[PDB]
């Protein structure tokens, strides 16, 4: 009765809002680490078949801004377009960069509308926005309509192991250097993916963002092989 559509079950919870949590866990892992000066995205990409090309889960919104997501890829692409449009508008019509948290205000309002009413579809995408704004800031966007700042996060399939590996070292992020953050991200992926050979030079793409500097993709050779 209460499973199909948007209403409180007798216990006082909406089952669809719990199902979107399973939905956002479908995509491949993204591991994000932030330090005041620089931040790192580490991803695991598996070819869906021997003849399928990689889907490039990480999307750069603007120089010094990166976005990535897990879940329904259509919603993720919608959010990428939304963030690009917001960057353009804020740069031109407001003379400033996007605020990592407040750039998600309209999207959060739309998501809240969707969670409050039936007929409209809930977003099935969980996003990570790593941007330089008075320093490097990392934001986690949830389909329920809330964007929260994090020291580091992991989204996608099997992301809880990465999350706990990151959480065991969160207090030391402000002291780690860029190589240390990349190493910790690769360690989190390894903990999620202890099976050897699966993680390789081809399946992992590492993105580096440093404050007051452009975002760059760096080779994974030095960290996996």
């Amino acid at each position: 009765d209460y499973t199909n559509y948007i209403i409180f079950n007798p216990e006082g919870k909406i089952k669809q809002l719990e199902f979107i949590n399973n939905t956002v866990q479908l995509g491949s892992t993204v591991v994000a680490l932030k330090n005041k000066s620089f931040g790192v995205f580490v991803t695991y990409n598996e070819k869906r078949s021997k003849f399928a090309l990689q889907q490039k889960k990480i999307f750069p919104i603007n120089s010094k801004s990166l976005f990535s997501f897990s879940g329904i890829t259509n919603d993720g692409t919608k959010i990428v377009k939304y963030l690009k449009n917001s960057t353009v508008f804020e740069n031109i019509r407001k003379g400033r960069d996007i605020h990592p948290i407040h750039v998600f205000d309209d999207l959060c309002y739309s998501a809240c509308i969707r969670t409050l009413t039936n007929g409209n579809r809930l977003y099935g995408v969980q996003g990570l926005l790593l941007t330089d704004y008075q320093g490097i800031s990392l934001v986690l966007f949830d389909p329920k309509g809330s964007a929260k700042e994090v020291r580091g996060m992991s989204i996608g399939s099997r992301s809880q192991s990465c999350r706990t590996i990151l959480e065991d070292e969160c207090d030391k992020f402000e002291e780690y250097n860029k190589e240390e953050l990349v190493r910790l991200g690769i360690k989190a992926l390894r903990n999620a993916y202890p099976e050897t050979g699966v993680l390789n030079k081809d399946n992992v793409d590492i993105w580096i963002l440093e404050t007051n500097q452009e975002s760059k993709q760096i080779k994974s050779e030095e960290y996996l092989q």
């Binding site: 559509y5 199902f19 399973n22 939905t23 479908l26 869906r48 078949s49 003849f51 399928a52 579809r121």
Partner: protein, 233 residues
């Protein structure tokens, strides 16, 4: 109506939308087809769904010309595919209107993926249907490189070196992982694709129950039966 829209948009406890899960069952209830990409050419062969021989072979075509250098093959519910083709043609012509160039195939795929899950939107041009399209598409084209793209009813798409759709998809894939090599000529490639197709066809493969589209840097060729006859042997 709100109830029907909610039925469209209800999520399953496992994740994926229920309607997407059902459309993915519907998407392969059709005749088989193979797409092969090589750095010189991209092929697309499909067996025709000739329900009766009284239905003339010419008029049951399964490949639609999306633009000057884009062709679209499909499997599953064939009714949805003409709407998809019309909207794809509109997108390509609008892209040329804005930018005076043939669009990248990836750009058309992005447009269609965006339009896929827009069941709720109230304007026709901003959605495909009120439900996922019950067809799986193999979209090929040339955009400074032979491109093979597969669009699923879930709105997801992937660029492929080779793919098969339809009831024979799994068998043809288990055969592709052994038989396919992209270092092969276009004529021998046509021979190989037709050989793979014939394995699953209900009846004997010939030049009248088969449709082949080969897009290359030089031409977006559609092979005549008198030309398929060359490769059937």
């Amino acid at each position: 109506s709100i109830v029907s829209r909610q039925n469209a948009n209800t999520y399953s406890a496992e994740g994926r939308l229920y309607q997407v899960e059902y459309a993915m069952q519907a998407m392969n209830l059709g005749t088989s087809s193979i797409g092969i990409k090589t750095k010189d050419y991209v092929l697309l062969a499909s067996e025709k769904k000739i329900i009766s021989k009284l239905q003339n072979p010419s008029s049951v075509k399964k490949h639609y010309r999306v633009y000057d250098h884009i062709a679209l093959g499909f499997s599953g519910i064939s009714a949805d595919v003409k709407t998809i083709v019309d909207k794809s043609r509109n997108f390509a012509i609008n892209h040329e209107y804005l930018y005076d160039e043939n669009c990248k195939v990836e750009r058309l795929l992005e447009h269609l993926a965006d339009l896929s899950l827009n069941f709720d939107k109230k304007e026709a041009d901003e959605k495909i249907f009120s439900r996922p399209f019950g067809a799986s598409l193999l979209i090929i084209g040339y955009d400074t490189e032979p491109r093979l793209f597969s669009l699923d009813p879930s709105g997801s798409y992937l660029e492929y070196h080779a793919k098969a759709i339809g009831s024979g998809s799994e068998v043809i894939e288990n055969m592709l992982e052994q038989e396919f090599d992209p270092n092969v000529d276009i004529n021998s490639g046509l021979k190989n694709i037709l050989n793979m197709l014939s394995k699953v066809m209900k009846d004997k493969i010939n030049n009248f129950n088969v449709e082949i589209t080969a897009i290359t840097k030089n031409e977006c060729k559609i092979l005549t039966p008198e030309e398929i006859e060359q490769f059937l042997e």
